[PDB]
Structure 1
Amino acid sequence: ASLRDIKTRINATKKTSQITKAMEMVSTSKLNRAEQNAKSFVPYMEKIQEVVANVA
Structure 2
Amino acid sequence: SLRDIKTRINATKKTSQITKAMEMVSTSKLNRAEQNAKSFVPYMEKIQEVVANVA
Q: Sort the TM-score into its range (normalised by shorter chain).
A: 0.7 to 0.9
Structure 1 runs of 4+ aligned residues shifted over 6 Å read none
Q: State percent identity of aligned pairs.
A: 100
Query: Alpha-carbon deviation of 1:12?
Result: 1.1
Runs of 5+ unmatched residues, structure 1? none
Runs of 5+ unmatched residues, structure 2? none
For the aligned residues, what is the CA RMSD?
A: 1.4
Query: Alpha-carbon deviation of 1:52?
Result: 2.7
Query: Alpha-carbon deviation of 1:49?
Result: 2.2
TM-score, normalised to structure 1, is 0.75
Alignment coverage as a number of residue pairs: 55
Query: Alpha-carbon deviation of 1:5?
Result: 2.0
Q: Equivalent residue for 1:4?
A: 3
Cα offsets for 1:12-31 (capped at 9, x unmatched)? 11111111111111111111
Structure with bigger gyration radius: 1
